[PDB]
Design a protein around this motif. Structure first.
Motif, PDB file in Angstrom:
ATOM      1  N   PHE A 140     -49.438 -75.120  71.249  1.00  0.00           N
ATOM      2  CA  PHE A 140     -49.976 -73.788  71.058  1.00  0.00           C
ATOM      3  C   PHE A 140     -50.568 -73.575  69.677  1.00  0.00           C
ATOM      4  N   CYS A 150     -51.401 -67.487  72.339  1.00  0.00           N
ATOM      5  CA  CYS A 150     -51.607 -68.412  73.448  1.00  0.00           C
ATOM      6  C   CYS A 150     -50.772 -68.056  74.667  1.00  0.00           C
ATOM      7  N   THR A 151     -49.655 -67.361  74.483  1.00  0.00           N
ATOM      8  CA  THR A 151     -48.812 -66.954  75.597  1.00  0.00           C
ATOM      9  C   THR A 151     -49.191 -65.591  76.157  1.00  0.00           C
ATOM     10  N   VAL A 185     -56.767 -74.463  74.054  1.00  0.00           N
ATOM     11  CA  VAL A 185     -55.914 -73.985  75.134  1.00  0.00           C
ATOM     12  C   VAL A 185     -56.763 -73.580  76.329  1.00  0.00           C
ATOM     13  N   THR A 191     -58.094 -70.248  86.586  1.00  0.00           N
ATOM     14  CA  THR A 191     -56.763 -70.622  86.128  1.00  0.00           C
ATOM     15  C   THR A 191     -56.106 -69.541  85.279  1.00  0.00           C
ATOM     16  N   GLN A 192     -56.672 -69.235  84.112  1.00  0.00           N
ATOM     17  CA  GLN A 192     -56.066 -68.286  83.189  1.00  0.00           C
ATOM     18  C   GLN A 192     -56.463 -66.837  83.414  1.00  0.00           C
TER      19      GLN A 192
END
Lengths: 607, 66, 137
Positions: A140, A150-151, A185, A191-192
């Motif tokens: 991260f 990043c989370t 990332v 996906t994200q």
């Protein structure tokens, strides 16, 4: 005895009573000091404090447990070394109790730790936080702010940045700052769901500067160039066109509206690290980078598309056509030399050797920097055959004509390379290039295995002695059998009951099976498969051809003199802000969909 | 692709059934892992990355990721 | 509702095996068809009954053909119930010992789960993997 009851006491947390009781036994047992309570209260093998082990296990009583721990550590004035302690182990090295509260998505505890003097700048560098072979590990960034970013935790990010002591520009052991980390990332939308672009915007707008986006990691790349090296399109479209509406921070935008009137508007793009006036730019990377295979959507973005287009309309067209002429005359003279074997040889042959040597040297140098380059091998092979045939013509040998004609035919096979200058033929040659790869080869393999099977099958039957009559036995050794079968595929071969073949029925059957397996089965299968591939390739062929054309364009650009290169210099100087003068690319647009009053713009008078 | 996966699979199991008892037990895909107090069972590890849904991890086996 | 009534009744025997050898889980397997047909209420009932009686007793038995309800779902063509049975994550810490899938560790997005190969991995006589492959029916 004492420690394990504490670690288990916080790990469980079902009883806070025996935590208070055990802690009371610790303080009373403390009458023997600050370093003592840290050693007894901290696991010596891994360097794990009880606060860490308390945060790793989330139960509804955990918050009160953390409060009790911090109050007990402050009463003895160990609070400084108690929070900031960190793993000594090789894999987890650097991890602090704040990384745990952020990783487990606990906002309250993270705030309590920050206000309690937790280090927000602590880098966690383990083997687990800087993985090679990314399957097992997570990278991260080192800093906690990069973890909260990043989370996808917008609240904790704002907490850390609003904290006065946080350093936004910190660079981890790899060289990456927080923006590099967000780039390494981000993956895709499927996906994200694209929360990284939001965080990138948030952090930039939160710290106004070009400091972040102008730095370089230890590989010497800005977060823009890094997004070019990697395959990340969704973050690259954002970074590459930014419109910041707030007049204070508007100086950070890479796209501006020069003027807008009604639907018509002329925007303006920033070419600084894009337009290939620098060493390694965004445009050189997205083209020459072969490790991605995302390059379709890469070159369709806003400034890149029209950079390539404008370069083509300026120079690369005429250099490409000119190259076509010089190669075409070369190959004609090569044919006229090959066909007639006084002064014609002296006039032409010299030029043949000259331009052949030029192709050999240039293509050879280009082949020293190594399925896209496959032409560089072919042109080189041609030139080698030509100059070799010249050497064998000056020297006395009979083998010169073979290499000469083979080089000629290969040249007319190399006319194909110049079909990429046209759209209609370019996509065509692309589709050929893919058909040869995906379809035809599979056919030729399974077909050659049959030629080799039936060849030895038939030669052994016709193997009887011809009785000094070459016409009686039509099949000699294994060569004549294969040649005869290949005749039969064209329709030349002679099919008849054969004398000298002691088994005329088996022979005929085994030949008919060849005809059936070839024509009505394995040759039509090819046509069906090609019909399957054309449907899928017809969509991407245009983008593929755009890629190839692009690489040619950049090659011609790299072959120009320094002054003639600077003569074109696509783009123009435009004043974005008070001190900001930057080379820009103008793109006119018309949008009827959404209407608004134009506030932020550059010139009032549309031009 | 699925059909070919099936055929390949049958070949794989055939080669497995042709091995000696000891060489077969030499590979023994999977590993012993302690699930519960008395539970030891051969397990197969599969690593995953999911960005879609976030949660605080409560039920898990080891605290220290390896 | 009626299922919960019967199980909550103290006298009901959950482990009863009918004349064919099937217990209740075998029965739920021989029924379940597909999602386009039943809209997958059988998986729910299977979960409900397992979680309601904690044990491996049900899922370890054998009908008169000598098959566990897992191996039976392998013999028959039932995929939707086999995915469920074959990966189970039970979140409640009391009954968590019944799961066939576990999370060894999880950090951020990355997580390493762990699967149970007992009747699967072909160290037994007729396993789930041998059946799904060699079964031509």
């Amino acid at each position: 005895r004492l420690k394990k009851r504490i670690f288990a006491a916080v790990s469980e947390g079902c009883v806070e009573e025996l935590v208070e009781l055990l802690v009371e036994l610790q303080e009373l047992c403390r009458r023997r000091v600050p370093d003592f309570l840290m050693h007894k209260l901290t696991a010596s093998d891994t360097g794990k404090t009880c606060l860490m082990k308390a945060l790793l296990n989330i139960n509804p009583n955990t918050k009160e447990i953390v409060r009790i721990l911090l109050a007990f550590a402050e009463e003895n004035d160990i609070l400084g070394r108690f929070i900031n302690a960190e793993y000594t182990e090789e894999a987890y090295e650097g991890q602090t109790a704040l990384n745990i509260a952020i990783e487990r998505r606990q906002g309250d505890i993270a705030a309590l730790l920050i206000a309690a003097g937790a280090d927000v700048n602590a880098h966690a560098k383990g083997a687990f936080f800087n993985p090679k072979y990314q399957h097992e590990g997570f990278y991260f960034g080192e800093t906690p702010l990069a973890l909260a970013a990043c989370t996808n935790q917008p609240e904790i990010v704002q907490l850390l940045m609003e904290h006065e002591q946080t350093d936004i520009t910190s660079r981890d052991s790899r060289g990456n700052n927080i923006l590099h980390a967000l780039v390494t990332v981000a993956e895709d939308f499927k996906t994200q769901n694209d929360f990284v672009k939001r965080m990138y915007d948030m952090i930039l707008l939160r710290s106004g500067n070009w400091e972040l986006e102008t730095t370089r990691n230890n590989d010497g790349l800005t977060p823009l160039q890094l997004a070019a090296k990697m395959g990340k399109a969704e973050i690259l479209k954002y970074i590459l066109s930014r419109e910041i509406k707030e007049k204070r921070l508007r100086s950070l935008s890479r796209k501006f509206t020069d003027w807008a009137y009604g639907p018509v508007s002329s925007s303006l793009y920033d070419l600084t690290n894009v337009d290939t006036t620098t060493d390694n730019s965004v445009l050189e990377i997205t083209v020459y980078n072969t490790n991605i295979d995302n390059r379709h959507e890469m070159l369709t973005l806003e400034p890149l598309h029209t950079l390539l287009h404008m370069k083509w309309k300026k120079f690369a067209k005429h250099m490409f056509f000119l190259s076509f002429c010089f190669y075409f005359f070369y190959n004609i003279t090569l044919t006229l030399v090959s066909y007639y074997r006084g002064w014609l040889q002296l006039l032409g042959r010299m030029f043949v050797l000259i331009w052949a040597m030029c192709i050999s040297v240039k293509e050879g140098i280009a082949i020293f920097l190594l399925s896209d380059a496959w032409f560089h091998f072919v042109f080189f092979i041609q030139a080698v055959l030509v100059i070799l045939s010249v050497f064998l013509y000056l020297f006395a040998y009979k083998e010169y004509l073979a290499c000469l004609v083979l080089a000629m035919a290969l040249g007319w096979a190399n006319m194909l390379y110049y079909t990429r200058g046209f759209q209609s033929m370019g996509m065509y040659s692309v589709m050929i290039q893919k058909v040869i790869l995906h379809d035809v080869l599979k056919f030729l393999f399974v077909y050659i295995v049959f030629l080799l099977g039936f060849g030895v099958a038939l030669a052994s039957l016709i193997e009887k002695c011809p009785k000094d009559n070459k016409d009686c036995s039509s099949y000699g050794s294994f060569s004549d059998a294969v040649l005869e079968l290949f005749k039969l595929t064209i329709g030349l071969g002679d099919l008849n009951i054969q004398q000298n073949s002691k088994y005329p029925i088996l022979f005929l059957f085994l030949l008919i099976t060849y005809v059936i397996l070839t024509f009505v089965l394995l040759l039509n299968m090819l046509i069906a498969l090609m019909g399957e591939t054309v449907e899928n390739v017809s969509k991407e062929s245009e983008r593929i051809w755009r890629l190839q054309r692009a690489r040619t364009i950049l090659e011609f650009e790299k072959m120009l003199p320094e002054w003639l290169r600077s003569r074109f210099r696509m783009g123009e100087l435009c004043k974005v802000a008070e001190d900001d003068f930057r080379l820009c690319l103008r793109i006119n647009e018309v949008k009827w969909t959404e209407w608004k009053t134009h506030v932020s713009f550059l010139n009032e008078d549309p031009g």
